[model samples]
Target chain A: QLHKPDVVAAATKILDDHGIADLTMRRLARELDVTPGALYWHFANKQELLGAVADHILRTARTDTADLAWREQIHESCRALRDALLSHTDGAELVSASFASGQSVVITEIVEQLGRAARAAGVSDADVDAAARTVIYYVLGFTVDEQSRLQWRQFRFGLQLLVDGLAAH
Target chain B: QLHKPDVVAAATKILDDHGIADLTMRRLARELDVTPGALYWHFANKQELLGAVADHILRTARTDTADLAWREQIHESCRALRDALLSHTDGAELVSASFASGQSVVITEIVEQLGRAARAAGVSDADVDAAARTVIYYVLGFTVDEQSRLQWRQFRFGLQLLVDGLAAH
Candidate 1:
């Protein structure tokens, strides 16, 4: 049975090998060792496949926790998500650029928890939402930049400084 | 003369039309109506070209202002940088993924100013560095995710909520 997970696994391999650039329906089919027709039968097109891939990555991470301080838990989850995304080639691109319901569920849960935490921190609901957004966005932004800067040979020093600055704080 | 500005303008156009996926030396030449050799004459390779492009975007927004408070100025500069990255197709990808010396100059200046502001806020130098990194990382991270989400047809409700929440505090 070709469930969403099967499609996601295939997509991850495709992303790792070909990157987001070369990810096409026909190419994915070849990598999956299936006919193009077979892939189309499961997913309508490349978008659907990418969406499945995003969902699979999020689900695998399953960034849910229980019985902890909201700030610490959120930070931990955010760090985990960043690390997980770093594991795959262009993984941040996949997660950020794909719009899948499965991915949304994970984010919604995190935001809701963050919302509660903000309240605990004596922030309003609106402020909580903003802080949560800042936290999520910061992680996403930092990871994407980190991935790209790592590829460049010359800017490693400056990147290191930035990291040092972050670590020091 | 084809200086850094010219390179950035050309690269921005390429990013808007073709995205990072199609940003190749040959492709950029096609866009610029010049031979790929002409481009290679200016840039050693695609990596060099990307660095120039990243630097160009970084330079477009200046951080100088005499009137605003330090935090306000800092936030404004961060937003300006974010907006610059948001302007092109896969703009965040372009800015976050490359390296350039000019880019470091801009960041270093900002970091220096942020350090000054941190001292004013009664933060230790180490703490200032950490705060500044947090702000910078948060801005970069949020912008990348926002751009990706926009590409994926995801609503910006999360972001709006964040802004509202932050304003309430």
Candidate 2:
């Protein structure tokens, strides 16, 4: 919206630093030294701004899981994805709400990578899409519940069960 | 709390009818035709009140799946659980945040029931606890994302993958 080479970049720095609550329009304006109106010129609401931030999170979740074993790709990538979102305040809320608004090419690409990994493992093409969604929903479900209580060990266990489940499929 | 089944019941009514934003202390007090302080005597805040409403949702999710097949019990009970949650506004947030607070005796009991059902399904006792948490977190994640989008048909597809995974393990 401005000479900002990194609007989303700027948004995310604030997200990780300030958390969800403090990452509001007024605060962003204060950070950028702009009016709320100027920010809105680029985004319709905080949900849309959240969409940008979520976009950045997915971009980061987009690791080269291409080389690892299929399930491990899924496993390691999902863990990375989960970690990226949890690094902020209300990261799950922001990510989930961003999806709710549905401008999710990046999210779609992320899921497709998971499905691609599943297919690489010989999961049926039919089960491929739904399988990816299962991993996604599991990660999403796990993180929000586990976020405040933040458990990598238990989270890895749950993720393994799910990816293992997909392994048989 | 004093016959204050009415408090939780009413808070839930407000939650479903008005959504999470509307389910506030003032609104709940108004719904009970009492002052905010009177309601406060029962719940310290909206989050505590949310725990009660969530308690009710799980109670409903507690279907009589006793006679159903093991995976069926897991499937049916979880579906009931998901449905009960999606029936209200911000229900996923209410439930997840409730779980986050961890004062949820009912929530813990519900997860234990799922574990029990899975055990009945012939899953090893070792995987029992993680599987229960997996399903719970998956449901919470799915509901939060899908609650407003309201996709029962697709949600079931993803869930079936999880239950099938659980059935194998």
Candidate 3:
């Protein structure tokens, strides 16, 4: 089996401590104790490596929102998302990079899942189309702030406010 | 006078046409058609360049909100913040990076404004503690997704829901 995932995971681990500049392929090879060229076969540029790591970060984003109601699922998933990013030193920036490049991976699932839940929770028909989209933005925003300043508990309050606001209608 | 602002503007112009990958310091110099070392006098590294740019992106975010009612301030400021990010291609990602680096700029002002509005919306004692942060997250999250996907109209509706929910309390 190919070791792209392993390589990506290792790259992420390196980024965790050394900072973004520390995530070079040569450095990655050093971490793995392989030749610097060894990573090229699995990842041509840091862009591809970033995409994989972004996917990896979201894959662990409490993917089990299946059983909860719409609000519960969105709230819980947002928390999971924030936690995942905070779990790594520069995880939030990586998420930003992933989106900026339009890598297109699990974030879609995360958004879609929240979209479905928002619709389920129900809102005005005018708001219906926007419900899922809006909530998804809130999650992205929440994590960015929380990670920057460790505003975890406060973020939960924000999430709860949105949930109550959406559910109230 | 500080040349930082001019440098930031020129770099952003480069970012508009090309994506993040092309926004390197060398690329910026080439765009300026400058001597290899010209930009070095102004910026220490790409990190400082990014910080200046982040500050530029947010500096125009309708800094004065002292007159509007708390709710009006939140709604209008949120709109201004989104529009600023939407003005650039990778604006959202930049916002993410700005915070991740603890670059510290008007976004803090944005968050604090929303935070103040959130509490003023008459949240219960318990929610008052968390209201501002939660809404701040919503704004950041909303803008990032909107810039990436153009969910502007729908995001407004969700924003309405949150404001309404917060006001109802």
Candidate 4:
């Protein structure tokens, strides 16, 4: 029998094997040996499935930085974020599109996860949200470029720049 | 009568009217009432055409920051970059995809423009490139999200954070 996790897992397989453009609901249904209606049973449409796939892509990002200093905590979280995004083909773009659709409340959970560290690091109450948002945006943008260029350097450099800026305040 | 600029302008119109997926060479050829072969006379392929369109989209980003302080120069440049990307529909994503394809050298010119400001602002030569890269990545990522959400705020907040960090250094 098919389950939601099974559908998500199949979708992710296609995402890594091909890319975002190829991971359509009809294609996914074929991959799962189910009908298109079956996918609808699990997800209202492709966007929802994409949201789930993006959430799955982010599972590897470890948020357990509570034991570290605030800056180090953010660094670790960002590194994990980059790693997870890089783990799949077009993963950063996929997650970015999903987050933009406003369907992925999971993004808020992750942002708040980073927010705790930002607040802990002394970002003012007013600016902590923006600070966390900045860090995520930088990582997402940098990783997309890195994935496209097929090179993986300069991430830490940019991350440090943000941390330096955050620490300054 | 078909010139490179004419082709680029037409493509930009299609981009604004439709979106990236709709702005194809075949569709462009139909729009200009010229054969797709005519487009090849100017661009080797769609990627080449996209590079040109990205450049055209960025024409509004002013680089005349000689009179401003280094931090202010970066702020203005970033703001201009955001404006240029936001002026057209899906413009940020289009330019970003072109840059990632390595077909757009114009991106390097813009980066260098920002790099000078970073160096002037006291970023060491070793880190200036990465610093500039970070700023552009932040703006591209932020604007793409903003464009998707159809709401535009928090841009200056993030820009200020980076500037503050740059000023601190």
Model 2, which residues run further than 4 Å from truth?
A1-10, A67-69, A121-127, A151-154, B1-3, B33-38, B64-69, B118-127, B151-156, B167-169
Docking class of 3: medium
Taking all chains together, the TM-score of candidate 1 against the true structure is 0.67
lDDT of candidate 1 over A50-133, digit per residue (tens): 767776666655565567764556555766777778787878767765622234455556567655655565545445566566
Could you estimate the TM-score for every candidate? 0.67, 0.82, 0.77, 0.88
Q: Judged by DockQ cut-offs, is candidate 4 incorrect, acceptable, medium or high? A: medium
For residues A1-169, could you state the per-residue lDDT of candidate 4 as single tens digits? 8999999999999999989889988899999998888888878888888999988888777578778888788878888888888889999888877876665666767788889988888778998888888888888778887777773366777787787777766
Q: Per-residue alpha-carbon lDDT of model 1 for B32-91, expressed as tens digits?
A: 777778887777777767767766667766667557775466556666777778887777
Question: Candidate 4 clashing pairs?
Answer: none
Candidate 4: tens digits of C-alpha lDDT, residues B1-169: 8889999999999999998879999999999999888899889898889999998888788668888888778888888889989899999889887877766676778889899999998878899988898998888878887787773366887887788778756
Clash-forming residue pairs, model 1: A126-B165, A127-B165, A130-B162, A137-B141, A137-B142, A141-B141
**Local lDDT at A129 for model 4:** 82
Model 1 residue B51 lDDT score? 68
TM-score of chain A of each: 0.72, 0.83, 0.79, 0.92
Ranking by TM-score: 4, 2, 3, 1
For this target, which candidate reaches the highest lDDT against the unseen true structure? 4
lDDT of model 4 at position A84: 86
